[PDB]
Amino acid sequence: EQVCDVFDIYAICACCKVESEVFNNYTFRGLGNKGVLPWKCISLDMKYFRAVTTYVNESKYEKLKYKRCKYLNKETVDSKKLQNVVVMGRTNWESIPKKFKPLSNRINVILSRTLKKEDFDEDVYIINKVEDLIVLLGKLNYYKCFILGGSVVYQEFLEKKLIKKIYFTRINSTYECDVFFPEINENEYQIISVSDVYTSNNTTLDFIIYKKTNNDDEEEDDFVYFNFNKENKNSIHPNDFQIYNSLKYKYHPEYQYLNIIYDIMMNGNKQSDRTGVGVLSKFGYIMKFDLSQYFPLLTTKKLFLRGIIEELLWFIRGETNGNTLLNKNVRIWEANGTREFLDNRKLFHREVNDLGPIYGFQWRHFGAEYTNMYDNYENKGVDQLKNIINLIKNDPTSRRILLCAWNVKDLDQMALPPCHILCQFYVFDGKLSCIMYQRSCDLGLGVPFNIASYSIFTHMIAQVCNLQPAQFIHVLGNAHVYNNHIDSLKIQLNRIPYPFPTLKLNPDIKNIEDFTISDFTIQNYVHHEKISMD
Amino acid sequence: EQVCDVFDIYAICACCKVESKKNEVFNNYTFRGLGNKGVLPWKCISLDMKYFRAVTTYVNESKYEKLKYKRCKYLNKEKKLQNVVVMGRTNWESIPKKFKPLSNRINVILSRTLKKEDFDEDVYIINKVEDLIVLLGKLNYYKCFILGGSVVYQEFLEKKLIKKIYFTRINSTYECDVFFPEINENEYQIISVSDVYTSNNTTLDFIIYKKTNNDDEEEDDFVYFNFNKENKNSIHPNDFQIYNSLKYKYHPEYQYLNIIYDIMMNGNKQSDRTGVGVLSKFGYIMKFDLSQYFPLLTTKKLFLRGIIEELLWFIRGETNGNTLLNKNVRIWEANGTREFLDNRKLFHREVNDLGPIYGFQWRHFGAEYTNMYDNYENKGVDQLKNIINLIKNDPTSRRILLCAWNVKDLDQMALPPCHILCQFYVFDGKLSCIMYQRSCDLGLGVPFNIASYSIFTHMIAQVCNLQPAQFIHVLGNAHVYNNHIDSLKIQLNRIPYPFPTLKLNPDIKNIEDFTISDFTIQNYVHHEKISMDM
Ligand SMILES: NC(=O)C1=CN([C@@H]2O[C@H](COP(=O)(O)OP(=O)(O)OC[C@H]3O[C@@H](n4cnc5c(N)ncnc54)[C@H](OP(=O)(O)O)[C@@H]3O)[C@@H](O)[C@H]2O)C=CC1
Ligand SMILES: NC(=O)C1=CN([C@@H]2O[C@H](COP(=O)(O)OP(=O)(O)OC[C@H]3O[C@@H](n4cnc5c(N)ncnc54)[C@H](OP(=O)(O)O)[C@@H]3O)[C@@H](O)[C@H]2O)C=CC1
Ligand SMILES: Nc1nc(N)c(-c2cccc(Cl)c2)c(CCCOc2cccc(OCCCC(=O)O)c2)n1
Ligand SMILES: Nc1nc(N)c(-c2cccc(Cl)c2)c(CCCOc2cccc(OCCCC(=O)O)c2)n1
Ligand SMILES: O=c1ccn([C@H]2C[C@H](O)[C@@H](COP(=O)(O)O)O2)c(=O)[nH]1
Ligand SMILES: O=c1ccn([C@H]2C[C@H](O)[C@@H](COP(=O)(O)O)O2)c(=O)[nH]1
Secondary structure, three states: OOHHHHOOEEEEEEEEEEOOOOOOHHHOOEEEEOOEOOOOOOHHHHHHHHHHHHOOOHHHHHHHHHHHHHHHOOOOOOOOOOOEEEEEOHHHHHHOOOOOOOOOOEEEEEEOOOOOHHHOOOOOOOEOOOHHHHHHHHOOOOOOEEEOOOHHHHHHHHHOOOOOEEEEEEEEEEEOOOEEOOOOOOOOEEEEEEOOOEEEOOEEEEEEEEEEOOOOOHHHHHHHHHOOOOOOOOOOOOHHHHHHHHOOEEOOOHHHHHHHHHHHHHHOEEEOOOOOOOEEEEEEEEEEEEOOOOOOOOOOOOOOOHHHHHHHHHHHHOOOEHHHHHOOOOOOOOHHHOHHHHHHOOOOOOOOOEOOOOHHHHHHHEOOOOOOOOOOOOOOOEOHHHHHHHHHHHOOOOOOOEEEOOOOOOHHHOOOOOOEEEEEEEEEOOEEEEEEEEEEEEOOOHHHHHHHHHHHHHHHHHHHOOOEEEEEEEEEEEEEEEHHHHHHHHHHHOOOOOOOOEEEEOOOOOOHHHOOHHHEEEEOOOOOOOOOOO | OOHHHHHOEEEEEEEEEEOOOOOOOOOHHHOOEEEEOOEOOOOOOHHHHHHHHHHHHOOOHHHHHHHHHHHHHHHOOOOOOOEEEEEEHHHHHHOOHHHOOOOOEEEEEEOOOOOHHHOOOOOEEEOOHHHHHHHHHHOOOOOEEEOOOHHHHHHHHHOOOOOEEEEEEEEEEEOOOEEOOOOOOOOEEEEEEOOOEEEOOEEEEEEEEEEOOOOOOHHHHHHHOOOOOOOOOOOOOHHHHHHHHOOEEOOOHHHHHHHHHHHHHHOEEEOOOOOOOEEEEEEEEEEEEOOOOOOOOOOOOOOOHHHHHHHHHHHOOOOEHHHHHOOOOOOOOHHHOHHHHHHOOOOOOOOOEOOOOHHHHHHHEOOOOOOOOOOOOOOOEOHHHHHHHHHHHOOOOOOOEEEOOOOOOHHHOOOOOOEEEEEEEEEOOEEEEEEEEEEEEOOOHHHHHHHHHHHHHHHHHHHOOOEEEEEEEEEEEEEEEHHHHHHHHHHOOOOOOOOOEEEEOOOOOOHHHOOHHHEEEEOOOOOOOOOOOO
16 A cells, blocks of 8 residues: 555656767666756657646546545545646746746646745645645545656655656657756666657657556457467467566567567477578568658667668679678678588589679669679669669659569579568658568568668668658568577567667768768667677 | 346357359348258357357356346346356257256256256256246346247347347358248347358358447556547548448458558558559558468459469460450450550550560560460479479478569560569468569459469469468558449448358369369358449
8 A cells, every 4th residue: 555556646757868888778867957958849758748747537536536535544535627736846847937837737736945835826736845745635636646857856756665657758869968867776667668669859769658566348258259269389488578578568669570579489380491490480471660750770689780781882783792792891691602602502603702693783784694793784684773763753653663683584593592572662742661572581680680771771762762761661471580599589579679760861862873881870879788699 | 228138148049051043142141041850950060169168158257246236226136157048948959968958057948848847957947938037037147148949039039138149150051941030130230250260161250240229557558658649531430330330350351341441541642554543552461361261252242263264374374365365354355455565665566465474474484575376385484383393392491482573574564463472381281372462453453363362372282282371462552443432432331251162173283284163162152243433
């Protein structure tokens, strides 16, 4: 029987990153700068705040007032339009512009030793000490009580264990800050929910929920009848996914990746393969990432992008020469170019690192006769890359905007047939979406890079066609987890994503061929520590 | 109040189709066969036995106290909870001794000719319906299920003592002499429709008719995370009245109907290559379990002769439109005309010479197309033969793909393929297929495309000694033509019937050996033909 649970006392805050790297929850702790917010205006966190702190459910008040009376050993509490209490520090209250006060449809309280009621109303309550809030809540009709802080207010409320939940906005950008939110003891509080990732006012943010740790139903039976035929399949335990299965709302788009790992681990088919390692496999998944709101670089481990950007630039040049990448210490294709690998593909007459008519060649020269990686292929075969950029510019409603790497004629001449079969483009209202069909998906190692590659490419094609990127849609055919990744992915699934980074391109690049490694910036990448998947 | 609502009195039945048909009309009354010669019309449908036992035995203890109050209040009152089951005397006498009385249920028999002295078993005898109501008032029980006789169903419906009918549609024909009463669409309407299943060589589903009226903390968190919830298009509510009245839409035909709904409500208005304009969206997945049913749409009439002739023409490697015209199959007639070929700039193409389309790419990818009469034997890649060989000899291959999108040949085709590729998956003796469709006409094309690739999956599985599992349909540019909207509004307010089954001649062992007479669609129950156009 606890005071926070009786009077439904919650903290709501927005924390940015702080100018001074290992990341943790404490990375997000910036509250204020010189008695104001560290940031200009984040209009989406403003709207979330207003909606959370003003929302009330009438039909739920009976149970709340009952509990409050029952616990105070009273039979009654004492307009009749139910509202929330909002508590502020003095410095916080005096931060707020005058006409923005008092906060609308909320009972405004102000912790202060040096204000006094008789220069405000009794609409706008005041209290000298913390215990004077519990007293005032005891005498009030209110839905819930929200601590809107000040670093001081939050500090004393958390250490006195008077907070049931923290509504915590992660502002994923760095500002000058002089006051910080206190370090949330992850023994005292734990995250039970994570929102979608959003862009507002040139930053990404998400909304998480910390919870104090515990140290017609005619149609409800019809649901049970429809499940009468429903079915550990693979030797995977519950305790394994404790944090993953503890979350209620898992709306962060990184869960589209994590949920597929979970599904293959729980329900996947045990299969041998080419590699001789064994996999769990399933067939047919879709993920969708909103490139207008974030860059979906996985945050539950560290990912590097230089190599995958160089690979894409090498595709766009129409190159097949593995040495070009090796000379820049990009080793993605090294194992596919060895004497031994090519001899096993029966490419006995192929030079080492001559990968044959792979992506680059099919994108710029589909149907040209491959000779060797040094030949001049200029104006030979179909320049599909040019054709799709022309169709996007000149016939945006075409349903034929496809870039295909799967050249059936040339497959046996490639060091290996492409995993990334095709990209299809869709244009609507100045916006570009991309579907990539992937025949073979290594969920542990390859798929995180593959999402980054095709997200970057969707931004590159958008910018050179004067469009804004919309959705990257990733279609997985044979989707597999290598048995040697299972322990590593167990670790990864029990990590809570961070708000995603943003991709910035040099805005001066207007032709697909003009991009260089320096034209790409990842911003505000906050990530858990690197995992070796093997 | 109402007697059926107080005492929670339900009917549960299983109805087959009855022997009376080239033009036969279908309605809910198609499923009416109950019994034959005092027993069931069929041998054993084990999945319906399972459903029957789960529905008539399920109780929810925590829900009982509320029902006790309801029944106490109506009457003016103060081991495990069980349901009551009521049967007719003839029904009772049909059950074998070893299954009588029905286990974990309170058994009740209606009889005039027999009294309790005539029964050894723990059963209540009642000689009047009125006495059932008295008995229910005197028992502790969860729900009351009327198990039939036709005589029993007839009188309980007549008296409006039925709150809901749990109705199994057995999609096969048998000799019957007793029939379920014709249901009045004004008294009872369908509220829920299950998945489709196969059991003992028949398809079936489970529908629910309803009597027409002729921590709750994370609940707030759910609203908080929903604070940013904004329908584009001028579609009216009442236009989807039946569609939106259903509680559970689990019939797999709703995968199709729900995509139509989504495009009508959220689709992007766009011109197209055609001039009609569309509503469009990008990226959907449907999954059809071919082990349980053949997914031939039931919300309108479809014939398969043409699409089977088209598939056999594809497999032969043919590009000659005249071959289909001579079988009165006009699917490709418009794309082979002088005008169409000239508008494609194929001035040097004979009428109905469709160029290197599907059949040619499947049997001869990379061969130079000449004309539709040439002998292309051993020219180009026989992909079809290679994928059959991979399925048989290397089943865990992630390279089992059939690709029609030959970038080099697109401009020589009457038109570029909509169905880009088929990828195959093999696990535990079963064959699954993904088809990726770049361009999907939801109103006219997609219904046929589902049937086409579902048949092809069955053909490939049989010639490789596998059982078909899933057909997975991935939609890229998915569009509804403006001229189809009013016909699709009608279609979406139709309730699917249990699906038919497809049988193949099991003597066919090679992909090239199928003929039209090797295919039977059985038990196709469908709503009326719709002209999608005006
Ligand atoms: N990012 C976010 O979510 C939020 C940021 N902010 C920002 O944070 C800053 C405000 O933070 P901070 O400087 O810590 O100031 P606070 O708003 O926490 O104010 C603290 C003052 O409130 C009173 N107080 C605190 N505890 C008690 C107590 N136990 N009994 C009586 N009075 C008490 C005292 O005022 P006195 O004794 O003088 O009367 C104390 O000096 C600003 O920059 C503001 O814009 C504020 C809220 C949320
Ligand atoms: N597919 C399905 O879901 C079902 C199929 N069946 C099949 O139905 C057939 C049996 O149906 P049907 O022939 O209609 O017989 P019923 O099972 O409806 O029983 C009829 C008998 O029950 C008694 N009865 C009915 N109403 C009353 C009443 N109001 N008061 C007193 N007694 C009453 C009478 O018994 P008495 O003669 O002793 O007075 C009457 O002759 C069988 O073929 C059985 O297999 C049955 C149920 C479900
Ligand atoms: N999730 C979350 N939790 C929170 N506690 C707060 C917050 C931050 C500072 C003050 C207050 Cl009352 C609330 C917010 C920021 C959005 C709401 O911010 C407001 C609302 C009303 C007035 C206001 O002051 C405007 C100017 C202040 C300045 O110049 O810095 C700020 N989000
Ligand atoms: N959905 C649905 N609703 C229903 N009312 C019934 C039904 C059908 C006949 C009798 C009875 Cl008690 C129930 C069923 C058929 C499956 C249940 O089948 C049973 C269960 C227990 C006994 C039994 O008796 C065999 C009848 C005579 C024969 O063997 O032909 C049949 N499904
Ligand atoms: O960009 C790539 C390249 C490879 N792979 C993985 C998928 C398979 O594990 C393997 C490709 O080999 P096959 O599927 O063809 O055997 O590498 C990816 O996920 N992405
Ligand atoms: O099997 C087929 C063939 C065609 N279409 C439809 C899709 C488009 O409406 C049109 C092809 O037009 P383009 O996408 O090629 O413009 O035909 C199908 O749905 N299925």
